[PDB]
Design a protein around this motif. Structure first.
Motif, PDB file in Angstrom:
ATOM      1  N   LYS A 173      -8.704   2.060   0.985  1.00 10.17           N
ATOM      2  CA  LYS A 173      -8.655   2.118  -0.241  1.00 10.17           C
ATOM      3  C   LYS A 173      -7.852   0.537  -1.214  1.00 10.17           C
ATOM      4  O   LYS A 173      -8.945  -0.219  -1.531  1.00 10.17           O
ATOM      5  CB  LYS A 173      -8.696   3.195  -1.595  1.00 10.17           C
ATOM      6  CG  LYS A 173     -10.221   3.883  -1.180  1.00 10.17           C
ATOM      7  CD  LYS A 173      -9.693   5.088  -2.342  1.00 10.17           C
ATOM      8  CE  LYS A 173     -11.159   6.296  -2.539  1.00 10.17           C
ATOM      9  NZ  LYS A 173     -10.557   7.245  -2.611  1.00 10.17           N
ATOM     10  N   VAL A 174      -6.555   0.374  -0.616  1.00 11.70           N
ATOM     11  CA  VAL A 174      -5.995  -0.242  -1.104  1.00 11.70           C
ATOM     12  C   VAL A 174      -6.133  -1.368   0.001  1.00 11.70           C
ATOM     13  O   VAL A 174      -6.384  -2.723  -1.045  1.00 11.70           O
ATOM     14  CB  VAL A 174      -4.239  -0.177  -0.863  1.00 11.70           C
ATOM     15  CG1 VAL A 174      -3.201  -0.683  -1.213  1.00 11.70           C
ATOM     16  CG2 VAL A 174      -4.235   1.914  -2.415  1.00 11.70           C
ATOM     17  N   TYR A 232      -4.711   4.375   2.084  1.00 11.78           N
ATOM     18  CA  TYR A 232      -4.337   2.920   2.466  1.00 11.78           C
ATOM     19  C   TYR A 232      -5.857   2.256   2.454  1.00 11.78           C
ATOM     20  O   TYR A 232      -5.993   1.155   2.434  1.00 11.78           O
ATOM     21  CB  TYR A 232      -3.824   3.303   3.787  1.00 11.78           C
ATOM     22  CG  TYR A 232      -2.468   3.670   3.872  1.00 11.78           C
ATOM     23  CD1 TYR A 232      -1.342   4.728   2.909  1.00 11.78           C
ATOM     24  CD2 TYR A 232      -1.444   2.283   4.403  1.00 11.78           C
ATOM     25  CE1 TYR A 232      -0.206   4.754   2.844  1.00 11.78           C
ATOM     26  CE2 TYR A 232       0.386   2.565   4.078  1.00 11.78           C
ATOM     27  CZ  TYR A 232       0.756   3.645   3.574  1.00 11.78           C
ATOM     28  OH  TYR A 232       2.382   4.000   3.770  1.00 11.78           O
ATOM     29  N   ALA A 276       1.098  -1.148   0.018  1.00 11.90           N
ATOM     30  CA  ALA A 276       0.269  -0.591  -0.052  1.00 11.90           C
ATOM     31  C   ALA A 276       0.456   0.997  -0.345  1.00 11.90           C
ATOM     32  O   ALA A 276       0.616   2.004  -0.273  1.00 11.90           O
ATOM     33  CB  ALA A 276      -0.692  -0.006   0.985  1.00 11.90           C
ATOM     34  N   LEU A 281      -4.840   3.660  -8.653  1.00 10.94           N
ATOM     35  CA  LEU A 281      -4.777   2.311  -8.182  1.00 10.94           C
ATOM     36  C   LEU A 281      -5.247   1.330  -9.200  1.00 10.94           C
ATOM     37  O   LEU A 281      -4.268   0.245  -8.163  1.00 10.94           O
ATOM     38  CB  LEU A 281      -5.539   2.853  -6.231  1.00 10.94           C
ATOM     39  CG  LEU A 281      -5.870   1.393  -5.881  1.00 10.94           C
ATOM     40  CD1 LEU A 281      -4.640   0.776  -5.038  1.00 10.94           C
ATOM     41  CD2 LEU A 281      -6.517   1.682  -4.745  1.00 10.94           C
ATOM     42  N   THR A 332      -9.138  -3.008  -1.833  1.00  7.67           N
ATOM     43  CA  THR A 332      -8.916  -3.588  -3.240  1.00  7.67           C
ATOM     44  C   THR A 332      -8.045  -4.917  -2.852  1.00  7.67           C
ATOM     45  O   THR A 332      -7.833  -6.092  -3.791  1.00  7.67           O
ATOM     46  CB  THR A 332      -8.280  -2.949  -3.905  1.00  7.67           C
ATOM     47  OG1 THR A 332      -8.500  -1.727  -4.100  1.00  7.67           O
ATOM     48  CG2 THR A 332      -7.663  -3.707  -5.367  1.00  7.67           C
TER      49      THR A 332
END
Lengths: 63, 58, 86, 201, 69, 58, 53, 70, 82, 125, 71, 202
Positions: I71-72, I69, H10, H41, I75
């Motif tokens: 969102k990651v 962070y 991340a 992203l 995902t």
């Protein structure tokens, strides 16, 4: 606990100092790494120290 | 600690070698195979020379 | 046997270090050497062997033939001198 | 009595200072702190202490280990062990049999708190991890404190005579002891040995 | 542990500045594996310049603690 | 035939003939052995395969 | 008498070299360890790949 | 694998998208920056998947031992 | 394929170290973007023109870091342990 | 593929993968030299191809194998004279730079001297 | 029948991350609407193959250097 | 059917190739595997360094002092580092060490940790960070083949030995201090058994 926290803080400060100094030296030195201005390097290091000091509380967190 | 130092050395060597070998981004060939070894050897030699000069007396 | 980039040119370094007016300098300029052919000339040259060997050693130090010649000549000098003294 | 011992660790553990500088005379009668593991073999030397017949007991103490096998997955090559003889103490003649083979001399030293120390030392090669993930790399360390002593020599007038074939020993022969126990560190073993000292129990 | 950490930091700095000097002198090439005399001289000059800069920085910092702390 | 049996046909054992034939085959093999899997019958693409040159001596 | 002809031949070779301006070290010259270039003992064989043929 | 590995992933993705978005203009944050970050992203995740697939495929197709079709 | 390698404190320290490295990287990135490292600038002074760029960088980082962070992490959807 | 086709393909790949499995086994007490680089290998192959291109017309026109064998033997002697030097220098070469220098010398010597000699002998024939 | 350790898995993931970062930086794969173009995909494939070759070569070189220093 | 050898070789070559495949499979798995030794096997004879040779040989013992004096880094004696910066860190109940580099610290921590050396099977680790390998058998097979190679999957002992050798090389070529070099003197001999028909030297 306090001693370990102080040691960790000192290690972080030393690493940040060295990294910022290296960044300034890389950005400033020229002519195949044969010429550099010491005063200008110091000024760059101080400016990057200020920037990192302002950025540290925002980015370094426990969440 | 020593393992960390060696790992950092190896990673930096790989990065600096690849940034030079793959400059054109073209697919690697059997000759590039040995060109990578050559760049790694040059990196090691340069590190040796630099460290020796730094630790030279006076 | 030594590649051009691996040659240290010690002979050239010695030639450069040599003085301005030198017999080696004249030879480099183009002076040609001819061995004496008369008995008197050979007799005179007989005493120049040591100087020639010394200068050749200084020029081409580490040369196989020159080093072997120096070693053999030194050993022969020692052996002959001790035999004569005995 | 001053009680100011010197800790033999790092490069000294592999090359003891007295062996390194041939200064056994200067180092004699000095408190030295060592760390390592003992061997199973024991040596007995006839001697009287406090007017009582007995045997001084000497054991190997591996102060350093070196690994010289690059074909780890092919062969389990034995390492090179640098060790010194250490006097475990004195026992009466009638209680000689009480000496247990490979006895637990001193409790193992507590494992270090720092995590980074759980790695093969660059000089000694030891790993103080209580449970090393590599079985071949597992090793237990104990800490001892002793006095470096000078090897003795033959003395007929002093009634110090040794019959190696008959297994009768009256003076410490470091050379012979190292030869019989087959210790690689023969030079240091002949140089000097340590006498373990403990606070009054 | 402090001595170990200092040694580790020193070695890391040595490696980093050696890499920096190599990159700045362009000693990294794929045609051969032997560094020429000119490239070796460039590396030595870069090392000397880095040493001088660090010496000056240390001297001035010792003389005056200009850092904001 | 490349190596006729008439060289040592007088002998019914054929040991000398066997030695000579194997020697000639090995002389051919020292030349053509390492290219067998690249440009001869041992190629993966069996369609465009060429007979090994030393087949007859073999 | 033993060394005169040998010395004369060596001197003639030296003079010929000087006249030709060949100041490089001659053949059969073996420098000391300091001037001897180290030999690279690190060799990495190329990755094996099945031949397309 | 450990969740610190995902945290490092991340961090890398965030640094890459920050470079891609602000390295060129370096303006004030706006609502459209949220959509730009989401798009970056997604693109970075797709690129990671593609490069991982190619890397694994190549290092698997590289011969390792004599073929055994059984 | 997550596994239990580190403990709680060790994991927290690793996260802190990663955040420290991210902070250094962001410092370098923002310095480069604001062009506060030139060969024609002298003295340890920061003009208001550069301070505005630094403030914009700080605000952008503060607003975007946590959201990106999260969102990651969503995902990635790494599976739980045990 | 069918069973027979799969077996044939497996046989071909296994026959081709001899080097893959022989690589792992290496000898300690060995005089190890620096292999010639792929670029120099290709350059030498191109030089040999140029020589073959020069030689092809005369050899094709010739109808008696004896003359072809004589030409081949002469050219082989000439090439082996330089091959000995190339091997001696490469084996003693202490770096890929030295290996490349030796290979460049070998290929240039081919391209000039071997080309001249081949043209001369072909014209003589 | 082969076994893999968590450290080896993490090292493989680190290699993948390094390759992804380098390829994205070189090919500017972030310049799109969330869908990779054909040219970007081809460049990423070439970069991934180059990275695989380079990492294998680097690992072999480091191992051989360690072995040489060993014996 | 014409039995001429060249055209007959057409039928013969496939059968010969099959027989060669069987023979080579046998040779690799059993004959060569048992007879041969890999990675330059040799016998090592160690020797201790004697006091005669130890005369004024180790003039430096504290490598840390030399590193501090000669390393190109800012002086570590400054008291600024105590409070130069402030960070939000807590719950540090055990000593923690800092690893440099933004890409190798995680690998170093994984190597240091013991739980990271627990073996895991493919059916348990068939899940890459973003790509799932359970529905991509071809990709799963490629992943298995990639991990088969020993260079990318090596034991902790091998990794530790490699790191030790690299550190020794770095220290020796930087500080030129012999304390890092091996104290033992090694004499290496190749004791190769030539009485074998499977493996031959050159």
């Amino acid at each position: 606990e306090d001693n370990y926290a102080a040691d960790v803080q000192r290690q972080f400060n030393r690493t940040a100092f060295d990294s910022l100094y290296k960044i300034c030296y890389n950005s400033l030195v020229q002519k195949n790494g044969s010429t550099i201005d010491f005063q200008k390097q110091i000024d760059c290091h101080q400016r990057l120290i200020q920037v990192f000091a302002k950025i540290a509380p925002i980015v370094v967190k426990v969440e | 600690m020593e393992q960390n130092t060696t790992q950092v050395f190896s990673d930096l060597a790989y990065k600096v070698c690849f940034k030079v070998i793959n400059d054109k981004n073209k697919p690697f060939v059997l000759h590039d195979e040995q060109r990578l070894a050559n760049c790694l050897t040059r990196y090691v030699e340069a590190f040796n020379v630099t460290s020796e000069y730094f630790f030279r007396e006076r | 046997m030594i590649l051009p980039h691996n040659n240290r040119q010690l002979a050239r370094q010695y030639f450069d270090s040599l003085p301005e007016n030198d017999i080696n300098r004249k030879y480099y300029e183009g002076l040609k050497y001819e061995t004496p052919k008369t008995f008197f000339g050979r007799f005179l040259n007989q005493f120049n062997i040591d100087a020639k060997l010394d200068t050749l050693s200084k020029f081409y130090t580490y040369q196989k033939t020159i080093r072997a010649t120096q070693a053999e000549l030194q050993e022969d000098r020692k052996s002959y001198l001790t035999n004569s003294l005995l | 009595a001053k009680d100011q011992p010197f800790d033999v660790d790092g490069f000294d553990a592999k090359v003891y200072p007295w062996v390194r500088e041939n200064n056994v005379n200067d180092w004699e009668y000095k408190l030295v702190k060592m760390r390592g593991y003992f061997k199973d073999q024991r040596f007995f030397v006839r001697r009287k202490r406090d007017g009582k017949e007995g045997f001084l007991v000497f054991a190997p103490f591996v102060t350093a280990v070196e690994r010289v096998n690059h074909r780890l997955k092919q062969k389990d090559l034995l390492p090179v062990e640098y060790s010194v003889f250490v006097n475990l103490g004195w026992v009466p003649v009638e209680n000689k049999k009480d000496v247990e083979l490979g006895g637990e001399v001193c409790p193992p030293m507590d494992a270090p708190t720092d995590s980074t120390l759980f790695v093969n030392d660059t000089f000694t090669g030891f790993n103080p991890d209580p449970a090393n993930p590599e079985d071949t790399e597992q090793v237990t360390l104990t800490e001892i404190t002793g006095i470096v002593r000078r090897g003795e020599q033959q003395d007929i007038l002093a009634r110090r005579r040794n019959w190696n074939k008959e297994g009768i020993y009256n003076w410490v022969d470091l050379d012979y002891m190292g030869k019989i126990f087959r210790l690689f560190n023969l030079d240091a073993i002949n140089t000097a040995y340590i006498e373990r000292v403990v606070p009054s129990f | 542990s402090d001595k170990r950490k200092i040694q580790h930091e020193g070695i890391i700095a040595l490696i980093n500045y050696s890499t920096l000097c190599a990159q700045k002198c362009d000693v990294l090439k794929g045609h051969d594996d032997k560094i020429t005399d000119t490239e070796e001289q460039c590396l030595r000059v870069c090392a000397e310049k880095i040493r001088q800069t660090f010496e000056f920085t240390n001297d001035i910092y010792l003389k005056n603690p200009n850092l904001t702390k | 035939t490349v190596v006729p049996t008439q060289t040592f046909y007088q002998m019914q054992d054929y040991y000398m003939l066997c030695g000579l034939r194997f020697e000639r085959w090995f002389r051919c093999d020292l030349v053509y052995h390492d290219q067998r899997h690249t440009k001869f019958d041992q190629v993966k693409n069996q369609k465009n395969y060429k007979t090994y040159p030393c087949y007859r001596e073999y | 008498q033993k060394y005169y002809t040998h010395m004369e031949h060596l001197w003639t070779v030296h003079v010929n070299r000087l006249n030709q301006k060949i100041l490089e070290d001659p053949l059969y010259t073996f420098y000391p360890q300091e001037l001897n270039v180290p030999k690279h003992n690190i060799i990495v064989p190329t990755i094996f790949r099945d031949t397309p043929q | 694998m450990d969740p610190v590995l995902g945290d490092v992933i991340a961090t890398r993705i965030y640094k890459a998208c920050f470079k891609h978005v602000y390295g060129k203009n370096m303006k004030a944050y706006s609502e459209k920056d949220e959509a730009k970050f989401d798009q970056c992203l997604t693109s970075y995740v797709e690129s990671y998947k593609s490069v991982t697939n190619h890397f694994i495929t190549y290092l698997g197709q590289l011969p390792k031992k004599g073929l055994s079709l059984d | 394929s997550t596994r239990k390698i580190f403990d709680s404190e060790e994991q927290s320290f690793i996260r802190l170290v990663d955040k420290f490295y991210l902070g250094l990287s962001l410092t370098k990135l923002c310095a480069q973007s604001c062009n506060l490292l030139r060969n024609d600038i002298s003295g340890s002074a920061l003009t208001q023109k550069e301070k505005d760029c630094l403030s914009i960088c700080y605000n952008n980082i503060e607003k975007t870091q946590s959201a990106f962070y999260a969102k990651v992490k969503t995902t990635m959807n790494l599976p739980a342990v045990e | 593929m069918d069973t027979i086709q799969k077996m044939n393909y497996e046989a071909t790949v296994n026959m081709g993968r001899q080097d893959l499995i022989t690589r792992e086994y290496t000898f300690y007490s060995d005089y190890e030299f620096i292999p010639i680089q792929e670029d120099r290998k290709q350059q030498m192959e191109d030089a040999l191809n140029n020589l073959h291109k020069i030689i092809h017309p005369t050899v094709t026109q010739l109808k008696k194998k004896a003359n072809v064998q004589e030409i081949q033997d002469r050219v082989f002697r000439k090439l082996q004279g330089w091959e000995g030097e190339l091997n001696t220098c490469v084996f003693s070469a202490k770096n890929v730079r030295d290996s490349n220098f030796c290979a460049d010398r070998f290929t240039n010597r081919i391209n000039t001297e071997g080309v001249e000699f081949v043209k001369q002998i072909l014209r003589e024939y | 029948d082969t076994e893999v350790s968590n450290h080896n898995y993490t090292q493989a993931v680190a290699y993948l991350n390094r390759a992804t970062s380098s390829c994205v930086k070189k090919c500017d794969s972030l310049n799109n609407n969330g869908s990779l173009s054909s040219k970007q995909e081809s460049c990423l494939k070439t970069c991934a193959e180059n990275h695989a070759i380079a990492t294998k070569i680097h690992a072999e070189y480091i191992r051989k250097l360690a072995e040489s220093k060993y014996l | 059917t014409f039995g001429e050898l060249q055209t007959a070789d057409d039928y013969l070559h496939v059968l010969q190739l099959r027989s060669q495949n069987k023979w080579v499979k046998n040779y690799w798995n059993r004959s060569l595997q048992e007879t041969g030794k890999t990675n330059k096997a040799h016998v090592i004879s160690p020797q201790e360094q004697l006091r005669l040779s130890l005369i004024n040989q180790y003039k430096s013992l504290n490598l840390s002092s030399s590193i501090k004096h000669n390393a190109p880094f800012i002086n570590r004696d400054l008291y600024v580092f105590d409070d130069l910066f402030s960070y939000n860190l807590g719950d540090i109940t055990t000593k923690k060490s800092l690893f440099n580099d933004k890409n190798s610290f995680l690998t170093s921590y994984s190597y240091l940790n013991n739980n990271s050396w627990n073996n895991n099977e493919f059916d348990l680790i068939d899940n890459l960070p973003f790509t799932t390998l359970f529905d991509n058998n071809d990709l799963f097979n490629n992943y298995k083949s990639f991990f088969q190679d020993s260079i990318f999957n090596s034991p902790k002992k091998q990794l530790s030995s490699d790191s030790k050798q690299l550190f020794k090389h770095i220290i020796y070529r930087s500080i030129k201090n012999n304390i890092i070099q091996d104290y033992t003197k090694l004499v290496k001999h190749e004791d190769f058994d030539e009485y074998s028909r499977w493996i031959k030297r050159s």
